[PDB]
Scaffold this active site. Structure first.
Site, PDB file in Angstrom:
ATOM      1  N   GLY A   1      27.242  64.064  29.595  1.00 14.54           N
ATOM      2  CA  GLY A   1      26.748  64.830  28.455  1.00 14.54           C
ATOM      3  C   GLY A   1      25.461  65.583  28.738  1.00 14.54           C
ATOM      4  O   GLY A   1      25.031  66.401  27.921  1.00 14.54           O
TER       5      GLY A   1
ATOM      6  N   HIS B   1      31.870  75.177  33.462  1.00 15.84           N
ATOM      7  CA  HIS B   1      32.863  74.113  33.391  1.00 15.84           C
ATOM      8  C   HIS B   1      33.075  73.574  31.969  1.00 15.84           C
ATOM      9  O   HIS B   1      33.890  72.674  31.802  1.00 15.84           O
ATOM     10  CB  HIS B   1      32.630  72.973  34.401  1.00 15.84           C
ATOM     11  CG  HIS B   1      31.424  72.101  34.164  1.00 15.84           C
ATOM     12  ND1 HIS B   1      31.392  71.166  33.143  1.00 15.84           N
ATOM     13  CD2 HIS B   1      30.301  71.966  34.906  1.00 15.84           C
ATOM     14  CE1 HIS B   1      30.233  70.539  33.263  1.00 15.84           C
ATOM     15  NE2 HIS B   1      29.546  70.982  34.312  1.00 15.84           N
TER      16      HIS B   1
ATOM     17  N   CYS C   1      24.991  67.737  31.199  1.00 13.30           N
ATOM     18  CA  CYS C   1      25.271  69.047  31.799  1.00 13.30           C
ATOM     19  C   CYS C   1      24.710  70.160  30.926  1.00 13.30           C
ATOM     20  O   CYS C   1      24.760  70.065  29.695  1.00 13.30           O
ATOM     21  CB  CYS C   1      26.766  69.230  32.046  1.00 13.30           C
ATOM     22  SG  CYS C   1      27.492  68.010  33.176  1.00 13.30           S
TER      23      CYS C   1
END
Ligand SMILES: COCC[C@@]1(C(=O)Nc2cncc3ccccc23)CCNc2ccc(Cl)cc21
EC number: 3.4.19.12
Lengths: 297, 300
Positions: free
Chosen positions: A135, A41, A137
């Site tokens: 942030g 993503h 991820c």
């Protein structure tokens, strides 16, 4: 003495954390040899979005050094960015897929910089009760077995209840989750029974015996009670895995089950076990043995 | 979202852990530049521990009596000196993995990460607080002595604790990295008992603010309290007195949530009175006191 939620030393993993930026999105990457793994993503039809990207669209920062992306491919929900430089700090590693109930350490990162390490378990509903902000991820979950890092989780998203969802390092999600902005909800969670029993054995090892009783139970009778209290069914494999703890404490697994059955039907009654008023389920039988024996990495 | 007890990444500290052996005793050392720091009781036998004269035991030792192992490499000890309860072993190799560091002495209520080690090998990392009675509720087995406590702020490791002993109640005592014990403890096998422990009030308030930040307000009430009235109630629950400094330190959390420190003090009073009634706060059925106001601002 003492029993704490203990995470593996994060050093071997810290040396792999990098910052990945694609357009406006900035998240973390795992740099192992010449490949940086991160949630797909970051490109945000992933095949269509990815084919429109060129290597230089992906900015990879390892500390104060920019890595040049020389290739890119997608494996499930993970993007694999081929970089020019092999990570000299790459440890001995494996990508493993864990089962619900199994625990691991999460090195939470923001902008390729590790900020904290914590221990947690894969819930029976495949979510993790983590501590993640925007942030985070691409932050990873791992275990250490001697000198080898077993990467088992990569953070992808937060569900509306505040719980977290992610994939193994091959990009396969844990649970019925998709990496898309859509109506997704964590299923009803259950207590990891084998872990509660292991934690009750850790309490016995630490001199906490108030909950013990003269009773035993059949495995089937325990599961009939456990199912009512939203506890995971205890299998014969779970009973076998608790064997060493049963031998060390002299308390049969089904004898400890009768203690757990009483705790479920009656509560703790103002008492605590290992400083807890709730039954802890995020220590596996192996975590208890490793901690109440001092295994090193 | 989510609130966890989070330890600092242990990497900068792992690269400093070494094994120190003196005779039959084997414990951990902290190798920073060309000095290995470890508990001075490494030179003691179990008999010596009753009434050890460390000056007398140390003067009988030479450099080659101290075996220092950094992984699979033996370090040569080229000097030794004692600073309070820490032995400082001068070695011939400076640690290339030495991070930017400081030795800081913490106050009760302060939290830190413990990299528990056995034989100079890190086995686990956990978070904990310096209790008001100066003990730490750690998880330490035999051989863990010399394991250190730290905080990592902007690439700099702040070494604040070195493990020395386990008290009869299962709690742990140690020193700062200058060898000064936290609390009225000595590195002597003598009748030593941890003082009566109290809850770190400022930390419970900070954790209640973390719960408010994460969307939990069930425990709030329409009441406020005077600081003196809060302390009179708090003392009855074995809670540490809340000072004006604690009120000042909670200021940013009070501004972020819009809940005055003395209004949050009133919720705490009510929680102590009522219990939780089957409810949890941040997944806990007990009031958590091992998150400082700074840890809450860090994590949220
Ligand atoms: C000669 O060295 C002795 C170490 C020892 C000690 O407390 N070790 C341990 C420390 N931490 C966790 C422990 C878990 C279980 C067992 C031992 C543990 C042994 C006991 N008497 C003593 C007295 C004073 C001091 Cl400063 C140290 C000790």
């Amino acid at each position: 003495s003492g029993f704490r939620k203990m995470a593996f030393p994060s050093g071997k993993v810290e040396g792999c954390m990098v910052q990945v930026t694609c357009g406006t999105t900035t998240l973390n990457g795992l740099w192992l040899d010449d490949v940086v793994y991160c949630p797909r993503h970051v490109i945000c039809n992933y095949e269509d979005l990815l084919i429109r990207k060129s290597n230089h669209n992906f900015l990879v920062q390892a500390g104060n050094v920019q890595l040049r992306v020389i290739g890119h491919s997608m494996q499930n929900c993970v993007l694999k960015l081929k970089v020019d430089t092999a990570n000299p700090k790459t440890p001995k590693y494996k990508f493993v897929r864990i089962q619900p109930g199994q625990t691991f350490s999460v090195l939470a990162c923001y902008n390729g910089s590790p900020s904290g390490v914590y221990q947690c378990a894969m819930r029976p509903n495949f979510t993790i009760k983590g501590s993640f902000l925007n942030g985070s991820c691409g932050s990873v979950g791992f275990n250490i077995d001697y000198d080898c890092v077993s990467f088992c989780y990569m953070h992808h998203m937060e569900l509306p209840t505040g719980v977290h969802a992610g994939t193994d390092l091959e990009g396969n999600f844990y649970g019925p989750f998709v990496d898309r902005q859509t109506a997704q909800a964590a299923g009803t969670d259950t207590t990891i029974t084998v872990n509660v029993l292991a934690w009750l054995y850790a309490a016995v090892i630490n001199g906490d015996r108030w909950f013990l009783n003269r009773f035993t139970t059949t495995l089937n009778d325990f599961n009939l009670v456990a199912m009512k209290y939203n506890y995971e069914p205890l299998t014969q494999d779970h009973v076998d895995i608790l064997g060493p703890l049963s031998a060390q404490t002299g308390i049969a697994v089904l004898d400890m089950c009768a203690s757990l059955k009483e705790l479920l039907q009656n509560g703790m009654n103002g008492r605590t076990i290992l400083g807890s008023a709730l039954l802890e389920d995020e220590f596996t039988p192996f975590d208890v043995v490793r901690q109440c024996s001092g295994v090193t990495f």
